[PDB]
């Protein structure tokens, strides 16, 4: 009897259902309920959509109303492990059945039901679909505005509901958001509509189970469009204007001064939007997120206030430290007034060593990914510091192997001075293009060249017999190291080509030599020159951003280097909006555009300018 | 731009050559499952592929199984 009424709702029969229901009612409550997954017959027909689904749903609801049991019928959850809270309303909203969802809601459906199943909360984003574990969140994420508006105005809907992840509807809309290519802008429209309908700040100030607001979650997840909307959110109506983050102080002609809120944006509230945008690394759209209105301006003013002098001081101190290290190492005996130089070398090497040590100890293993584009200089500065430390450590005792570490420290220190080229723009582009080139195609060329060099070196060294008596300079390709050195000298264009070696097969020796000449000088090196042209072509446009990312990292690191005092150099003013208490911060930005030509109503101050 | 394909052509050639190198046994590593369609006999093989797209927004009628996932 159960299988007959369960297999008939899928096909959508309007006349067989009543006949199968009258005898079922007269047989006798645990009748129309599956015993494995709890799939009730009401929601059983929702997945199989037929033109007669609405009719049989109405008959099922009427039969439930006529036998005085409706609470257990329409508020029936699942039982499986993968589905712990899926109901009739969830699957009806997903099937784009607004009329069926309205009929279920008007009959007493569980609006605040949580679909906390394992399928609903995926871990690999391939076997599941996360929407917020709420029918309202599902309607918002599936571009169903009519269902959302039908759900907000209700007597028991909880907009501020938090699922098992701590997320809310705004958090879920942030997570499911994407760029314009993959999906449309409906998420931003849904975010705006739900936030305006709620009319409160508790939705955007609620932290999930990660210590993140939806604004901070949008900054962390890489959602540049949602962050752009929230950061520059201006609301024209006066009934709810405290929900805005940007306020137009005045607008005189094509010149407008806007105030940007900096509550959790400026790096003064632990986890801020600027710090999250800059320091995190597991995103690809990091460059376009820093181009927004408040973040760019804040980075500019920070650089023009304290980061410029700090970077110049660090450059000068490292340059003087390298100069005096070079002077005291090259002018070794092989000095009371000259003792200050070596003492300063030791002190500054220890300072760099401890600074890099504490900067490596808390360094994440996520920024160590990609190809050393954000932590390589930390390692080389630490290596140079410990090289100087070990050099003086072996110099204090009677260790002859102390000059090697000192000379390596000089070479690395003068190589590490190219880090400071990021202060200027053009040298910054040059440095990051050095980075991409030396990791992309210099390494491949080195790998292939070393394979050819060692193979041909060991092939040529085997074609020469031993030298006769009273003779040692018979052939330059004597051993394997000698043949490798000769091929390396030939590659760089040094020396003289001698073919009269002590080879028993001089023709094969010349053939292998010419083959090496072609493969390296004609093919490998010239193709390398051709390849790094393509590299500098691609990174030609991808250089005004990555350099600015490095600059932003240096600005934030320099600001973190400041103590608890001396950091009282906040952005701009205190007055931000019309709120009578807690004006927080603001950031004046002036914009010029000659295309709108509209009457200014959202203006705040009648008198423009200061 | 004509390097992400030719290399994959060489990779596919090596994959097929390596599979042909396998003996009559040890080749029992077929793609995925047996159940493919509603046909009562000779279900043959199948290959589960998951796709994500946020542009259709249509009611699913050609679906086969009511319970998603495993
Ligand atoms: C297109 C071409 C350009 C170059 C391409 C690459 C070419 C590379 C090819 C190089 C081979 C060149 C000849 C090797 C020497 C042979 C003779 C010799 O002295 O043998 C010595 C071995 O010699 C070595 O091991 C040398 C040191 C390492 C060589 C590789 C450095 C790579 C640096 C990369 C840095 C990172 C990358 C840089 C950028 C980030 C043996 O010792 P000896 O001295 O004979 O005496 C023994 C000592 N004893 C007596 C105390 C016991
Ligand atoms: C290997 C590749 C090294 C270069 C590289 O990674 O690029 C560097 C740039 O490059 C430069 O601007 C030059 C670096 C100095 C010379 C590099 C060769 C080593 C010489 C050795 C001579 C013999 C000594 C041998 C000692 C063992 C790294 O730049 P980046 O990734 O843009 O910096 C980001 C890191 N940060 C955010 C923490 C600041
Ligand atoms: C997660 C990170 C947190 C770090 C917290 C550390 C503790 C903080 C507490 C205390 C440390 C206080 C400063 C220590 C200075 C010695 C350190 C040193 O070697 O020079 C530092 C320079 O730093 C300066 O230029 C010093 C500025 C001191 C403050 C005065 C500012 C005045 C601005 C007046 C304006 C009007 C380091 O320089 P760098 O550019 O970092 O070095 C580059 C190499 N790297 C890229 C590999 C790093
Ligand atoms: C010169 C070579 C010597 C030998 C080096 C050998 C080793 C080679 C290694 C490196 C050399 C090449 C790179 C050098 C980078 C360090 C300087 C720097 O960062 O300047 C910067 C800060 O510095 C100032 O302008 C200082 C301002 C006053 C500070 C007062 C402190 C007290 C200049 O910044 P900017 O981007 O010009 O300023 C932006 C504003 N603008 C665009 C309107 C101008
Ligand atoms: C000591 C030096 C060793 C340092 C090892 C660092 C590895 C860096 C790899 C790297 O830059 O990848 C490059 C490839 O690079 C290759 O294909 C490398 C092949 C092996 C050669 C390694 C150096 C040999 C030096 C002589 C022995 C970049 O390749 P891509 O196509 O741009 O890869 C895209 C993804 N990626 C940009 C995130 C990498
Ligand atoms: C970076 C890592 C890569 C490369 C680093 C170098 C790898 C090999 C190291 C050998 C060094 C050595 O001591 O050789 C010795 C012999 O050894 C040989 O003759 C070895 C021959 C096979 C290996 C090299 C050729 C093929 C490499 C294929 C490419 C490999 C992978 C490349 C990846 C880019 C030196 O012999 P000798 O100079 O005659 O000594 C004189 C004394 N005697 C006459 C008494 C013997
Ligand atoms: C492969 C088959 C064997 C090759 C070696 C032939 C023998 C040889 O050593 O001859 C030559 C190398 O040999 C060449 O002339 C090689 C030329 C390049 C071979 C690959 C071409 C592509 C050198 O031989 P030889 O000792 O200088 O004189 C040969 C004596 N005979 C001509 C009287 C025979």
User: Which DSSP string do the residues of A353-377 spell out, in sequence order?
Assistant: HHHHHHHHHT--SSTT-SSSTTTHH
Q: Rounded CA gap, A216 and A218, in Å?
A: 5
Q: How was this structure determined?
A: cryo-EM
Count other C-beta atoms under 10 Å from residue A560's C-beta: 11
What is the CA A500 to chain-centroid distance, rounded? Answer: 61
Task: Say what the resolution is, in angstroms.
Answer: 3.1
Q: Rounded CA gap, A273 and A296, in Å?
A: 12
- B53 closest CA partner among A130, A145, A184: A184
Q: Which two tokens stand for residue B27?
A: 């080749």
Count other C-beta atoms under 10 Å from residue A297's C-beta: 16
Identify which of B50, B55, B70 has the shortest CB distance to residue A183: B55
Q: Rounded CA gap, A217 and A299, in Å?
A: 21
Q: Which two tokens stand for residue B68?
A: 């998603």
- A191 closest CA partner among A258, A242, A145: A145
Q: Which two tokens stand for residue A503?
A: 């080879």
Contact A119 B69 (CB under 8 A): yes
Q: Please provide the DSSP assignment of A400-451 as one string.
A: STTHHHHHHHHHHHHHHGGGGGGGSHHHHHHHHHHHHHHHHTHHHHHHHHHH
Q: Does B59 touch chain A (CB under 8 A)?
A: yes
**Contact yes or no for A128/A120 (Cβ under 8 A):** yes
SS3 state at A332:
coil
The gap between the terminal CA atoms of chain A, to the nearest Å, is 82
**Contact yes or no for A265/A225 (Cβ under 8 A):** no
SS3 state at A143:
coil
Q: Rounded CA gap, A81 and A63, in Å?
A: 30
CA distance A96 to chain B (A): 6
A257 forms beta bridges with A250, A590
Contact B57 A142 (CB under 8 A): yes
Phi, psi of A495, deg, nearest 5: 85, -175
Q: Which two tokens stand for residue A221?
A: 């997840």
Q: Rounded CA gap, B69 and B5, in Å?
A: 33
* Residue A414, ligand 2, Cβ within 6 A: no
* Residue A305, ligand 4, Cβ within 6 A: no
b/e for A135-161, b at 16 or more Cβ within 10 A?
bbbbbbbbbbeebbebbbeeeebebeb
**Contact yes or no for A248/A256 (Cβ under 8 A):** yes
Q: Which two tokens stand for residue A572?
A: 């701009």
In the numeric block, the tokens 């499986």 are attached to A80
- A513 closest CA partner among A487, A484, A485, A492: A487
Q: What angle do CA A80, A81, A83 make, to 5 degrees?
A: 65
Q: Rounded CA gap, A379 and A360, in Å?
A: 8
Nearest CA to ligand 3 atom 9: A561
A591 forms beta bridges with A256
Q: Rounded CA gap, A211 and A35, in Å?
A: 41
What is the torsional sign of CA A397, A398, A402, A406?
positive
In the numeric block, the tokens 């090289």 are attached to A387
Q: In Å, what is the CA distance from A479 to each residue of A111, A147, A215, A457?
A: 83, 82, 67, 9
Residues of A comprising the binding site for Na(+)?
A: 493
SS3 state at A237:
coil
Radius of gyration of chain B from its Cα atoms, rounded to whole angstroms: 18
**Contact yes or no for A227/A215 (Cβ under 8 A):** yes
Closest atom, ligand 1, to C-alpha of A525: 1
- A543 closest CA partner among A440, A441, A434: A434
CA distance A430 to chain B (A): 26
Residue B17 burial (CB < 10 Å; 0-12/13-18/19+)? exposed
* Residue A421, ligand 4, Cβ within 6 A: yes
A20 CA distance to ligand 2 middle (Å): 79
Radius of gyration of chain A from its Cα atoms, rounded to whole angstroms: 36
Report residues whose beta carbon is within 6 angstroms of any ligand 6 atom.
A 447, 450-451, 454-455, 458, 479-481
Q: Which two tokens stand for residue A214?
A: 């939806």
A247 forms beta bridges with A259
* Residue A485, ligand 1, Cβ within 6 A: yes
Residue B31 burial (CB < 10 Å; 0-12/13-18/19+)? exposed
A418 CA distance to ligand 4 middle (Å): 12
**Contact yes or no for A269/A263 (Cβ under 8 A):** yes
Q: Which residue of A has its CA nearest to B1?
A: A534
Q: Rounded CA gap, B34 and B46, in Å?
A: 6
Reported residue count of chain B is 70
Q: Which two tokens stand for residue A145?
A: 């505005």
Contact A49 B60 (CB under 8 A): yes
The gap between the terminal CA atoms of chain B, to the nearest Å, is 39
Q: In Å, what is the CA distance from A38 to each residue of A100, A121, A172?
A: 21, 20, 27
Q: Which two tokens stand for residue A532?
A: 């790094």
* Residue A484, ligand 1, Cβ within 6 A: yes
Total beta-carbon pairs less than 8 A apart between chain A and chain B: 36
Q: In Å, what is the CA distance from A9 to each residue of A4, A382, A590?
A: 9, 71, 63
A444 CA distance to ligand 3 middle (Å): 36
Q: Which residue of B has its CA nearest to A95?
A: B59
A105 CA distance to ligand 1 middle (Å): 79
Q: Rounded CA gap, A579 and A582, in Å?
A: 7
Count other C-beta atoms under 10 Å from residue A121's C-beta: 18
A527 forms beta bridges with none
**Contact yes or no for A233/A243 (Cβ under 8 A):** yes
Provide the chain A residues 121-140 that lie in CB contact (below 8 A) with chain B.
126-128
In the numeric block, the tokens 């000059």 are attached to A403
Q: Which two tokens stand for residue A248?
A: 């137009």
Give me the long-range contacts of A118-126 (CB less than 8 A, separation at least 24): A118/A81, A118/A82, A118/A84, A119/A82, A119/A83, A119/B68, A119/B69, A120/A83, A120/A85, A120/A86, A121/A164, A121/A165, A126/B50
Phi, psi of A63, deg, nearest 5: -65, -35
Give me the long-range contacts of A9-13 (CB less than 8 A, separation at least 24): A9/A41, A9/A44, A9/A45, A9/A48, A9/A56, A10/A44, A10/A45, A10/A48, A10/A50, A11/A48, A11/A50, A12/A45, A12/A48, A12/A50, A12/A51, A12/A52, A12/A53, A12/A55, A12/A56, A13/A52, A13/A56
Q: In Å, what is the CA distance from A177 to each residue of A127, A142, A221, B29?
A: 18, 11, 9, 39
**Contact yes or no for A289/A277 (Cβ under 8 A):** yes
A409 CA distance to ligand 2 middle (Å): 14
Reported residue count of chain A is 610
In the numeric block, the tokens 């031993």 are attached to A466
**Contact yes or no for A586/A573 (Cβ under 8 A):** yes
């Amino acid at each position: 009897l159960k299988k007959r009424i369960f297999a008939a709702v899928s096909e959508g029969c309007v006349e067989e259902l009543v006949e199968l229901l009258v005898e079922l009612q007269e047989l006798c409550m645990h009748k129309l309920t599956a015993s494995d997954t709890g799939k009730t017959c009401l929601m059983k027909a929702l997945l199989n959509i037929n033109p007669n689904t609405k009719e049989i749903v109405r008959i099922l609801l009427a039969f439930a109303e006529e036998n005085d049991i409706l609470g257990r019928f329409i508020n029936a959850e699942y039982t499986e492990e993968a589905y712990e809270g899926q109901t009739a309303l969830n699957i009806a909203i997903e099937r784009r059945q607004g009329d069926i969802a309205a009929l279920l809601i008007a009959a007493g459906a569980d609006v605040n039901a949580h679909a906390k199943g394992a399928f609903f909360n995926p871990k690999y984003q391939h076997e599941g679909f996360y929407f917020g574990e709420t029918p309202l969140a599902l309607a918002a994420c599936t571009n169903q505005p009519e269902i959302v508006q039908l759900l907000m105005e209700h007597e028991q809907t909880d907009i501020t509901s938090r699922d098992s992840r701590g997320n809310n509807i705004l958090h879920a809309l942030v997570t499911v958001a994407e760029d314009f290519k993959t999906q449309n802008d409906f998420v931003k429209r849904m975010y705006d509509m739900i936030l305006l309908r709620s009319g409160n700040w508790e939705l955007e100030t609620t932290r999930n189970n990660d210590g993140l607001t939806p604004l901070q979650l949008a900054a962390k997840m890489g959602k540049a469009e949602i962050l752009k909307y929230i950061l520059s959110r201006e609301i024209k109506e006066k009934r709810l204007r405290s929900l805005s983050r940007k306020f137009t102080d005045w607008a005189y002609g094509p010149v407008s001064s806007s105030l940007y809120d900096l509550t959790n944006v400026d790096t003064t509230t632990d986890n801020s939007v600027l710090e999250i945008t800059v320091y995190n690394t597991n995103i690809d759209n990091r460059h376009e997120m820093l181009t927004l209105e408040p973040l760019h301006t804040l980075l500019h003013m920070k650089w023009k206030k304290f980061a410029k002098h700090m970077f110049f001081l660090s450059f000068c101190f490292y340059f003087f430290y390298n100069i005096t290290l070079t002077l005291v190492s090259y002018y070794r005996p092989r000095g009371w007034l000259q003792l200050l130089g070596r003492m300063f070398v030791l002190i500054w090497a220890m300072c760099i060593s401890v600074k890099e040590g504490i900067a490596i100890f808390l360094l994440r293993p996520s920024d160590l990914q990609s190809i050393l584009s954000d932590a390589w200089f930390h390692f080389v500065f630490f290596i140079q510091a410990v090289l100087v430390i070990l050099s003086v450590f072996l110099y204090l005792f009677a260790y002859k192997e102390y000059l090697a570490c000192l000379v390596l420290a000089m070479a690395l220190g003068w190589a590490n001075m190219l880090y400071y080229t990021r202060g200027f723009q053009s040298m910054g582009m040059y440095s990051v293009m050095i980075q991409k080139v030396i990791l992309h195609d210099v390494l491949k060329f080195l790998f292939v060249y070393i394979v050819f060099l060692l193979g041909f070196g060991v092939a040529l060294a085997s074609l020469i017999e031993k030298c006769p008596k009273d003779n040692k300079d018979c052939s330059s390709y004597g051993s394997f190291s000698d043949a490798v050195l000769e091929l390396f000298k030939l590659t760089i264009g040094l020396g003289d080509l001698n073919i009269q070696q002590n080879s028993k097969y001089p023709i094969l020796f010349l053939f292998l030599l010419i083959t090496y000449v072609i493969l390296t000088f004609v093919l490998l090196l010239n193709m390398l020159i051709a390849l790094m042209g393509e590299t500098v072509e691609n990174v030609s446009k991808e250089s005004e951003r990555i350099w600015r990312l490095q600059r932003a990292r240096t600005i934030l690191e320099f600001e973190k280097m400041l103590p608890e005092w001396l950091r009282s150099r906040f952005r701009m003013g205190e007055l931000c909006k019309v709120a009578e208490d807690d004006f927080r911060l603001c950031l004046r930005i002036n914009e010029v555009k000659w295309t709108e030509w509209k009457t200014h109503v959202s203006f705040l101050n009648e008198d423009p300018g200061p």
